[PDB]
Amino acid sequence: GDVVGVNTTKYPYRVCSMAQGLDLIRFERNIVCTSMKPINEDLDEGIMVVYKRNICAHTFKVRVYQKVLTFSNTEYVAPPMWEIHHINSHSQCYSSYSRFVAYHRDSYENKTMQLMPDDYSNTCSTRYVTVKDQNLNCMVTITTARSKYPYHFFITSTGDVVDISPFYNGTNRNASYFGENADKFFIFPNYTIVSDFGRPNSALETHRLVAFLERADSVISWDIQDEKNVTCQLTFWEASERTIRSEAEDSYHFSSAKMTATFLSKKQEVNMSDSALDCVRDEAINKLQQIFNTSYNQTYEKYGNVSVFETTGGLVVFWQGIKQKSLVELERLANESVHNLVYAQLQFTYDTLRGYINRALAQIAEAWCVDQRRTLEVFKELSKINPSAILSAIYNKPIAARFMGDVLGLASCVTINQTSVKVLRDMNVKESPGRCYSRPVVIFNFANSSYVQYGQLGEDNEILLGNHRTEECQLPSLKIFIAGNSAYEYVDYLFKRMIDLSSISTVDSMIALDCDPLCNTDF
Amino acid sequence: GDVVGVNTTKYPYRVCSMAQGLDLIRFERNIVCTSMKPINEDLDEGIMVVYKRNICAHTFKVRVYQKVLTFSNTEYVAPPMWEIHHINSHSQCYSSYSRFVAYHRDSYENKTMQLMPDDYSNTCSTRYVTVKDQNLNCMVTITTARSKYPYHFFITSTGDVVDISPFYNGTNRNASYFGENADKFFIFPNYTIVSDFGRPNSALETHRLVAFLERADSVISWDIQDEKNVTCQLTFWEASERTIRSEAEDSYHFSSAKMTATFLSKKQEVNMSDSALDCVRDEAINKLQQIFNTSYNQTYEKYGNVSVFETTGGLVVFWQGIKQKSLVELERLANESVHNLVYAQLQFTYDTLRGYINRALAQIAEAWCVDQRRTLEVFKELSKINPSAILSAIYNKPIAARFMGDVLGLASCVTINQTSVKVLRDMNVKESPGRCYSRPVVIFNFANSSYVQYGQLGEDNEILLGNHRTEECQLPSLKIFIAGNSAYEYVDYLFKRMIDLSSISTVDSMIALDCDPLCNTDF
Amino acid sequence: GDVVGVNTTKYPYRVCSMAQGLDLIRFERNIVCTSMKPINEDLDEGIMVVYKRNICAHTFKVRVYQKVLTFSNTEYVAPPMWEIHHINSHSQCYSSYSRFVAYHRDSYENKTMQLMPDDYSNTCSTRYVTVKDQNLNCMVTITTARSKYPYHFFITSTGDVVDISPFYNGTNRNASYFGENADKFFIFPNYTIVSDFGRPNSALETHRLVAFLERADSVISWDIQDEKNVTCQLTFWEASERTIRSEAEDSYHFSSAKMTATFLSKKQEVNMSDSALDCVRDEAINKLQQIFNTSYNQTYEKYGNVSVFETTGGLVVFWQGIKQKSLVELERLANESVHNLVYAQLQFTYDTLRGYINRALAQIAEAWCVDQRRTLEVFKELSKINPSAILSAIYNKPIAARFMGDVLGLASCVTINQTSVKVLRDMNVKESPGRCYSRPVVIFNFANSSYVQYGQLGEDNEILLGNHRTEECQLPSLKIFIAGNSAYEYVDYLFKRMIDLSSISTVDSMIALDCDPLCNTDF
Ligand SMILES: *[C@@H]1O[C@H](CO)[C@@H](O[C@@H]2O[C@H](CO)[C@@H](O[C@@H]3O[C@H](CO)[C@@H](O)[C@H](O)[C@@H]3O)[C@H](O)[C@H]2NC(C)=O)[C@H](O)[C@H]1NC(C)=O
Ligand SMILES: *[C@@H]1O[C@H](CO)[C@@H](O[C@@H]2O[C@H](CO)[C@@H](O[C@@H]3O[C@H](CO)[C@@H](O)[C@H](O)[C@@H]3O)[C@H](O)[C@H]2NC(C)=O)[C@H](O)[C@H]1NC(C)=O
Ligand SMILES: *[C@@H]1O[C@H](CO)[C@@H](O[C@@H]2O[C@H](CO)[C@@H](O[C@@H]3O[C@H](CO)[C@@H](O)[C@H](O)[C@@H]3O)[C@H](O)[C@H]2NC(C)=O)[C@H](O)[C@H]1NC(C)=O
Ligand SMILES: *[C@@H]1O[C@H](CO)[C@@H](O[C@@H]2O[C@H](CO)[C@@H](O)[C@H](O)[C@H]2NC(C)=O)[C@H](O)[C@H]1NC(C)=O
Ligand SMILES: *[C@@H]1O[C@H](CO)[C@@H](O[C@@H]2O[C@H](CO)[C@@H](O)[C@H](O)[C@H]2NC(C)=O)[C@H](O)[C@H]1NC(C)=O
Ligand SMILES: *[C@@H]1O[C@H](CO)[C@@H](O[C@@H]2O[C@H](CO)[C@@H](O)[C@H](O)[C@H]2NC(C)=O)[C@H](O)[C@H]1NC(C)=O
Ligand SMILES: *[C@@H]1O[C@H](CO)[C@@H](O[C@@H]2O[C@H](CO)[C@@H](O)[C@H](O)[C@H]2NC(C)=O)[C@H](O)[C@H]1NC(C)=O
Ligand SMILES: *[C@@H]1O[C@H](CO)[C@@H](O[C@@H]2O[C@H](CO)[C@@H](O)[C@H](O)[C@H]2NC(C)=O)[C@H](O)[C@H]1NC(C)=O
Ligand SMILES: *[C@@H]1O[C@H](CO)[C@@H](O[C@@H]2O[C@H](CO)[C@@H](O)[C@H](O)[C@H]2NC(C)=O)[C@H](O)[C@H]1NC(C)=O
Ligand SMILES: *[C@@H]1O[C@H](CO)[C@@H](O)[C@H](O)[C@H]1NC(C)=O
Ligand SMILES: *[C@@H]1O[C@H](CO)[C@@H](O)[C@H](O)[C@H]1NC(C)=O
Ligand SMILES: *[C@@H]1O[C@H](CO)[C@@H](O)[C@H](O)[C@H]1NC(C)=O
Ligand SMILES: *[C@@H]1O[C@H](CO)[C@@H](O)[C@H](O)[C@H]1NC(C)=O
Ligand SMILES: *[C@@H]1O[C@H](CO)[C@@H](O)[C@H](O)[C@H]1NC(C)=O
Ligand SMILES: *[C@@H]1O[C@H](CO)[C@@H](O)[C@H](O)[C@H]1NC(C)=O
Ligand SMILES: *[C@@H]1O[C@H](CO)[C@@H](O)[C@H](O)[C@H]1NC(C)=O
Ligand SMILES: *[C@@H]1O[C@H](CO)[C@@H](O)[C@H](O)[C@H]1NC(C)=O
Ligand SMILES: *[C@@H]1O[C@H](CO)[C@@H](O)[C@H](O)[C@H]1NC(C)=O
Ligand SMILES: *[C@@H]1O[C@H](CO)[C@@H](O)[C@H](O)[C@H]1NC(C)=O
Ligand SMILES: *[C@@H]1O[C@H](CO)[C@@H](O)[C@H](O)[C@H]1NC(C)=O
Ligand SMILES: *[C@@H]1O[C@H](CO)[C@@H](O)[C@H](O)[C@H]1NC(C)=O
């Protein structure tokens, strides 16, 4: 018997599977704390923007053309290139394949066929077929592909690896890579492809350079683009409006009151007119200008130009120094030699105490590093037990991860029906007496699908697959498992009742007021 | 064989049992961080007091009248209401029960009997019996009962649930609830009850309205009181003396230097003359006044009246703005137009730099939120392994909790003899070779009791019951277990000796100075 | 089959073994938070140095003289005292032992023999033998010994315990201890010992008082030194240059912006001319003077003398108050009655706002205590799973520890060959089907040794010994284990390939930018 799940928005019912072992991540002791010695108090003030080196892989759309022969053996084969041109120009595919000849079931027509959407396809690998039989079929998949720097090869979402640079345009093999078979690669200038293969009549679109590669079981096509125009090696991390900077003999140390991180760099600057900054220069400059306009246009003035620094940790810093206007000007905006001396003394007092404040703020900012390093070690230790929760806490977004020894694998989640989730009432393992499930078993259905699947209920509405988590049936038992807006009581590994979530208090770490439980009476 | 435990004050030897699954608690991602954008520096200063919504259940005393028939079947039955009046007025009970008639062993007297204390009873369920035989007996238990808002039903410590509002006084069923059998409920104006049932002659006391309900096996009585007079939905959390507040277009943001939490509310205020604030208004007002008198009466002045705000997180804030007296007044307390201008310039400089300081403090206070959120996730992950330790760390008090899947159950601890704790010498499981106990087995005795109980030694002098924790006998073994002021060495799962606690160093996280261990010599 | 490890500097391949259960450590709730109530703003400023009570054991070199009889029974015996004098004066040992008489194999010479280094010996227990046969042999070990306060006994690295004070010089048994057999103890004034026993001719050195004790199987010798001259009960923890101090009615509270810890003491001072401060007085004084010279010689002046305080937590504080020079002097260094009044008003304004800043800084410093206490509880909970990692994070140095119930044992690591580390390809337990290793098995060799040892690969290049960690073979499997600069893929518990470390991203907690994994397609 069953009981029925309840929807939720940010954490939908989903099955998260590991990306074939490819998206690996690991913890490293990369937090280094260096306490600044001098108590020097003439610190500079300014606006700062921080960019991080882009490690994420460039993602681009590819097309995968195949024909399917069934006798359930399901042989996949490459369509001929003329048939590929038919598919790209007319969105139609011919009803035969020849190697000696085969046709759709009980047919000989070699007629043209109109491609139609496969409704079983997803937001990745959107698929089109000529015969909707979800014999011979013709199939076109449009899907993602990822390539990490250096872009000398790319891996498509279907797991095929191609040893060709996604930016090799047939005239730059000296600045790119090509490692696949030469006789099976074809670049086409001004190639015309239809907008949607599933439409009987679609708006044709011309693409500058389209590349094709004849795989063994497939033909893979992708649109060649300009590297410097589509890929940027720096990703904007964060802008700090109130930044202070202390100068050493060969170091600039940047601190921010709102940030728990301090940056350290050499006093030599980066050439701002360098090509590696081309995709972030204007953005960073305008970000600095915006922060000035909205915050310091009236009370401050720009001191120097924009200076680019490279942090010891690898970050890139764009710096705009700011200096507050004199107190005479500030007062005039808010509204004789002896009066000039009075204002000079006021300015000296103000500057001295402001430098004291800035030194104190810099020390406060430096005070966070040891705590951050120790919490990093805490995260590394806890990631062996629940890597998904730890990485979600670190990155402040729902992240699924799996433990792989000394590394973690990132996983991608497929949203399921959300209304087919049926939780089983009996958590006792009937197939093995003495063993009980750790979390309740769920019946669920994938989208646009009807085959009932059996998984196990996880946390945050996640559905688990594979080997079910089991344990010893330690009677008496009383467990409460939450899914959606609902809680399920299991007494002695059998479903008892529903529980209102309002009947369960939430831990408040900020306030931390506790309620006394019911007393016991030596019973 | 045995070895003897040693006392300790804050963590007495105790057995902690879960409150029947009723006192549930869970972790939720309830820490939300919203970084304030503007660097506006005209922040307000003031005193703040913060109250939290009262989630704890209202607790009130009830009386449970029963008679006990033994033939060990121990049938419990409801005493007749006239016998209830005898018990309440004379503290005496009649020696018979009729349904056809029964008496104390080998008796027919139907004599009156004087109630005497049951010394086996505790600080909860204090109990009185007529025959001290720890046959027919007469018994009166006085015990706690809890009711959560809305007070439409209450659960007594003995686990009986009653569907009657603890504040239904027989004339307000429109503003209360009554769901029990009507024929079995009786309210009595000006009911006279004795102070102590165990005293031969006690001081009688009149109670305005006393309610009785005839259960199947019991009669339950409670004193009806005024809701608004006995229940308060707001609990005082904390007062901040140095509070700063930044004003947005539709937000007030409160920060405190001593607090790691910042509050955010709309600029619309709460009506301070609202009935829901009646039980906290005067207290909060006097708290604000006290903080002013002891801290700001001389150097500051009150700016505005007391403003009540409702925080986005549900807290209630009482705010008193304060403004420091002019520097001329401060100097005069510490002790012409051109001199007025000089003092105006001094005041302008002071105000500008003070606003800078306040903005920096607000940013520092906001810097804690991400760290607090990540530590909340750390606590949630660690609470699956040791919920009691994690909740004790969060609430800064000894808390016992049990893991119940996606929730935690709060547990209540019964203090045991404290001198009957005998630790067994052999941690090897004799009943199953190859298995060994994880922690040493303890013989202990409950208070006022003699039946020896067998449990397992826990941490912080806790005694564990139920299924003993076991593991594989991984020889060689060397474990040291601490109870009281003493440490027990177990070598190869057999007790070796005592260990002086002074011979074991304590980890110092603040100082963190380490001592090198004895070197090894490739042996 | 095997695959070959790769070197690393800070974490060399090593085997870490627990120091016989002697170097115990435990977590205790020793962080106490006391929030200061008054908002009083006339805080003192000064330089502070903090020393901690020395808990580490005094370590001193000892010599262990033995003769070895083999018939593999390997009886160890004490050399006669005249032979001990021969060893100490000539670095030579006689070729016989008598109790009736024995000689080197097939010999009768009773000739003198020259001691030569045993190359199998380490940086601890450096060893010298007369016959290099790694029968009768003569052996001299030079090794460490530890004694904790009170120094009434010491334990040598070979584990022998001696009930004699390392500072008993034969004339101070009233201020020391002697508990070993009186007839077997001999102190020798101006004893001459050679610098190196392994050298044919070495530079003789005279030692004031050398003590010998005739053990059953050994003779143990050590050089008696002056306690007060070799042992210091206070260890320097840390110096704070910018320290603020708030005065209560019976308390001084010290805070530092760069520190997350605040200190609290009574206002009564420690006598700086006390003998217990003799080994830290000059150092602390000069440290204070250095901080003044390099930071405050120009802008500040010393206020009062050096005051020594004892913190409630047991720390020792040396305090130098500093007061900034008047603004007139500061301005003159940077470069009538009415002008004196103007400068007095400027100074009053500056002092008022500076006191406000100092009060805010003190509150900020106090804000860390609850977070530190909660993180201490987090560390205590996590140390049961991985004590070495937690203690390494706390002390910021590579520390190996073992779990021992309610305590942790510190362990010492022996560096191995570093080039003999061979990782096995098959992680499946051949001796028991259905069980698999948790981490890959390693073949390794100890230094100067050839017997191949079988251990298990740990983290940070650690080699594990004893019972191998095992688990269920949960196929399919894909694990990646890192050693040196290399990563090993194991698919289905069989070695697959090497993995470039650059292909694995590192978690960045400070920046926290995430890359999306490859999407899934309902497969
Ligand atoms: C079904 O009908 C279609 C046409 O209605 C046939 O397609 C034709 O197939 C031949 C090869 O069998 C193509 O010749 C190829 O031409 C390209 C240049 O365009 C050349 O590079 C190749 O080496 C080869 O010679 C021919 O172009 C193509 N007709 C088109 C594209 O209009 C198909 O063969 C028929 N199949 C069966 C099984 O009857
Ligand atoms: C033992 O002796 C006592 C008196 O010494 C007997 O108590 C009496 O019990 C009867 C019922 O059996 C009570 O009558 C009840 O009166 C109330 C009104 O007061 C009425 O609502 C009930 O319906 C019922 O008529 C009587 O009041 C009570 N006497 C008192 C309270 O003084 C008891 O029955 C004797 N038991 C035996 C087994 O002999
Ligand atoms: C091997 O030859 C050496 C000398 O070449 C012999 O050493 C001698 O041994 C005797 C004891 O057997 C030592 O006498 C002892 O003298 C000390 C005072 O020095 C005294 O306290 C003892 O009670 C004992 O009388 C003698 O000094 C020593 N000769 C030296 C040091 O030059 C050794 O006995 C020979 N062994 C064999 C097995 O032949
Ligand atoms: C193919 O790609 C190369 C770069 O790999 C292109 O060469 C660049 O062309 C632009 C535009 O003329 C120049 O500004 C760059 O300096 C060139 N860089 C290099 C390294 O050659 C080339 O133009 C592309 N070819 C086609 C046909 O699109
Ligand atoms: C920073 O890099 C730019 C180019 O990115 C350099 O500009 C060159 O300057 C020299 C000298 O004036 C000219 O002859 C070149 O034509 C410039 N190149 C370009 C592409 O404009 C600039 O000099 C560099 N700055 C430093 C300090 O090395
Ligand atoms: C029973 O309880 C009701 C409330 O539920 C009492 O009614 C309140 O009585 C006080 C005093 O007269 C008034 O100030 C309140 O306004 C009343 N409130 C309501 C909602 O009625 C009632 O007085 C109680 N009855 C007895 C007999 O004590
Ligand atoms: C806040 O609530 C109080 C009552 O709690 C309101 O007081 C009422 O004010 C009106 C207008 O003066 C009077 O006619 C009523 O008699 C008052 N009621 C009581 C119980 O005194 C007050 O007006 C409310 N304030 C706002 C801004 O709505
Ligand atoms: C043996 O040790 C004692 C201390 O235990 C030494 O006595 C100290 O000697 C110095 C130098 O004369 C004096 O300043 C100390 O006051 C003495 N202290 C005590 C407690 O006696 C003694 O001198 C040592 N003896 C030898 C022979 O070295
Ligand atoms: C602090 O201790 C020193 C000794 O360590 C004390 O100095 C003694 O002072 C008295 C009075 O002047 C002299 O008679 C002694 O000779 C001194 N002893 C030494 C060893 O010099 C000092 O008085 C102590 N201070 C306080 C406040 O008790
Ligand atoms: C592709 O189209 C553009 C625009 O018409 C043209 O300049 C270019 O020459 C075309 N390609 C080739 C290979 O001629
Ligand atoms: C800020 O203002 C300047 C002119 O003062 C302008 O050049 C710049 O583009 C502005 N930046 C913005 C609007 O982001
Ligand atoms: C800043 O840039 C201007 C040109 O825009 C240049 O004249 C000036 O010298 C630069 N600043 C410095 C400090 O050299
Ligand atoms: C999802 O489940 C509902 C309820 O069973 C069903 O009506 C609907 O067709 C399903 N949607 C799919 C399978 O796409
Ligand atoms: C209860 O006692 C009070 C005080 O004597 C009295 O006013 C009230 O009327 C009594 N109850 C009834 C129901 O008469
Ligand atoms: C504070 O002083 C005022 C008078 O200035 C008084 O009304 C108020 O009750 C006092 N608050 C206290 C003592 O808590
Ligand atoms: C504060 O309360 C007084 C009455 O006590 C009232 O006159 C005054 O207007 C209130 N404050 C404001 C800002 O309206
Ligand atoms: C507690 O134990 C002590 C020692 O056995 C015993 O004398 C005492 O009576 C006990 N107290 C009880 C059972 O209340
Ligand atoms: C040890 O040598 C010193 C220095 O020559 C000497 O003063 C002392 O008296 C010697 N020892 C004995 C016991 O004579
Ligand atoms: C600091 O300077 C003073 C003289 O002003 C000197 O006595 C003291 O030793 C110096 N301290 C050092 C150099 O550490
Ligand atoms: C500081 O020490 C000097 C002697 O160096 C002494 O005269 C002075 O009184 C001491 N300070 C105080 C505050 O007593
Ligand atoms: C360490 O291993 C290397 C490689 O096997 C070997 O040549 C060398 O002798 C070893 N060193 C020792 C055993 O001290």
Side-chain angles (χ1 to χ4, degrees), chain C residues 149-169:
Chain C
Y149 186 91
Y151 309 100
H152 288 180
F153 67 92
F154 60 91
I155 299 175
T156 178
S157 66
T158 60
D160 197 10
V161 51
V162 177
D163 296 350
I164 306 171
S165 293
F167 312 113
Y168 172 60
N169 60 11

Side-chain angles (χ1 to χ4, degrees), chain A residues 5-8 11-15 414-416 418 421 461 463 483-484:
Chain A
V6 179
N7 303 303
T8 289
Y11 299 94
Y13 296 97
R14 59 197 178 287
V15 168
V414 181
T415 305
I416 64 172
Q418 302 218 76
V421 175
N461 307 329
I463 309 298

Side-chain angles (χ1 to χ4, degrees), chain A residues 330-502:
Chain A
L330 259 60
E331 184 171 34
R332 183 170 57 74
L333 270 42
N335 291 175
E336 300 298 312
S337 303
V338 177
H339 301 164
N340 290 181
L341 291 169
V342 170
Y343 278 120
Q345 294 161 9
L346 287 164
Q347 193 68 64
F348 180 81
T349 302
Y350 181 89
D351 293 357
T352 301
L353 199 51
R354 192 173 178 117
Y356 179 74
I357 298 156
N358 293 347
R359 183 78 278 170
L361 295 180
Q363 290 189 330
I364 290 166
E366 271 295 319
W368 292 91
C369 188
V370 176
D371 179 68
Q372 295 306 291
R373 186 183 65 206
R374 286 177 175 184
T375 53
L376 176 67
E377 294 306 310
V378 168
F379 296 154
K380 180 174 181 180
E381 184 55 37
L382 281 175
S383 72
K384 303 179 181 291
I385 312 180
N386 194 348
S388 67
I390 298 302
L391 294 190
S392 302
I394 291 171
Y395 294 101
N396 191 233
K397 57 172 61 185
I399 290 173
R402 303 298 179 241
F403 177 80
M404 296 175 64
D406 294 353
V407 312
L408 308 176
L410 296 166
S412 53
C413 306
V414 181
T415 305
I416 64 172
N417 182 296
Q418 302 218 76
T419 72
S420 65
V421 175
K422 302 297 176 66
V423 195
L424 273 66
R425 291 186 185 224
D426 189 7
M427 286 181 60
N428 203 295
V429 181
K430 306 177 180 183
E431 292 78 4
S432 175
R435 271 276 161 162
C436 283
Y437 293 114
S438 298
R439 301 191 64 85
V441 179
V442 162
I443 288 161
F444 67 102
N445 279 119
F446 287 110
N448 300 344
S449 307
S450 297
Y451 185 65
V452 287
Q453 325 281 354
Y454 282 69
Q456 189 168 36
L457 182 65
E459 297 186 307
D460 296 324
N461 307 329
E462 185 180 339
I463 309 298
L464 308 175
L465 292 183
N467 299 97
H468 296 170
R469 302 300 295 271
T470 60
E471 60 183 44
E472 303 302 304
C473 307
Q474 295 184 358
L475 279 73
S477 179
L478 172 65
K479 265 67 182 60
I480 294 165
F481 300 103
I482 299 175
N485 305 121
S486 74
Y488 306 79
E489 266 188 358
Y490 287 79
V491 179
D492 299 334
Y493 303 93
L494 276 162
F495 173 71
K496 184 65 177 71
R497 59 175 175 162
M498 301 303 297
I499 291 299
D500 188 5
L501 291 196
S502 301

Side-chain angles (χ1 to χ4, degrees), chain A residues 286 289-290 293 297:
Chain A
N286 291 306
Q289 281 171 0
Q290 183 181 359
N293 300 358
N297 190 64

Side-chain angles (χ1 to χ4, degrees), chain B residues 79-179:
Chain B
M81 285 301 299
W82 54 265
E83 198 178 297
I84 304 299
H85 288 66
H86 293 313
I87 294 171
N88 295 331
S89 306
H90 310 123
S91 71
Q92 302 211 0
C93 177
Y94 278 83
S95 183
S96 187
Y97 182 65
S98 179
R99 290 198 281 197
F100 173 79
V101 64
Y103 303 99
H104 304 175
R105 195 193 301 159
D106 301 344
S107 188
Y108 296 93
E109 295 279 23
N110 195 28
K111 64 180 185 176
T112 182
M113 293 289 296
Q114 182 56 53
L115 282 166
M116 60 189 68
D118 183 355
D119 300 318
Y120 294 72
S121 71
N122 318 114
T123 53
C124 277
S125 299
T126 308
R127 189 194 300 130
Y128 306 92
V129 295
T130 53
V131 185
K132 206 175 182 182
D133 67 353
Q134 283 76 8
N135 190 39
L136 179 80
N137 202 350
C138 178
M139 184 185 298
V140 180
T141 304
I142 187 165
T143 201
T144 56
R146 289 193 178 260
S147 60
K148 289 184 180 176
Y149 186 91
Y151 309 100
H152 289 180
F153 67 91
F154 60 92
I155 299 175
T156 178
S157 66
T158 60
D160 197 10
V161 51
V162 177
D163 296 350
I164 306 171
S165 293
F167 312 113
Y168 172 60
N169 60 11
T171 62
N172 62 349
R173 195 174 176 179
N174 182 65
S176 294
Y177 185 81
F178 176 78

Side-chain angles (χ1 to χ4, degrees), chain A residues 17 23 25-26 29-30 56 122 124 146 237 345 356 374 376 381 384 403-404 406 412 446 509, chain C residues 242 343 358 374 386 394 439 459-460 479-480 482 505-507 509 511 515-520 522:
Chain A
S17 181
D23 294 308
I25 194 170
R26 71 184 174 89
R29 285 175 289 262
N30 55 6
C56 310
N122 318 114
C124 277
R146 289 194 178 260
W237 174 59
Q345 294 161 9
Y356 179 74
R374 286 177 175 184
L376 176 67
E381 184 55 37
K384 303 179 181 291
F403 177 80
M404 296 175 64
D406 294 353
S412 53
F446 287 110
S509 302
Chain C
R242 286 303 312 151
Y343 278 120
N358 293 347
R374 286 177 175 184
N386 194 348
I394 291 171
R439 301 191 64 85
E459 297 186 307
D460 296 324
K479 265 67 182 60
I480 294 165
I482 299 175
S505 302
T506 58
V507 178
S509 302
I511 273 62
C515 303
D516 302 330
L518 289 166
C519 46
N520 279 344
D522 189 4

Side-chain angles (χ1 to χ4, degrees), chain C residues 49-67:
Chain C
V49 309
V50 187
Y51 288 66
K52 195 208 184 184
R53 291 293 297 183
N54 186 17
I55 306 302
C56 311
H58 168 62
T59 302
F60 60 102
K61 296 186 299 183
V62 305
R63 296 168 297 278
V64 185
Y65 313 88
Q66 297 182 280
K67 314 192 79 150

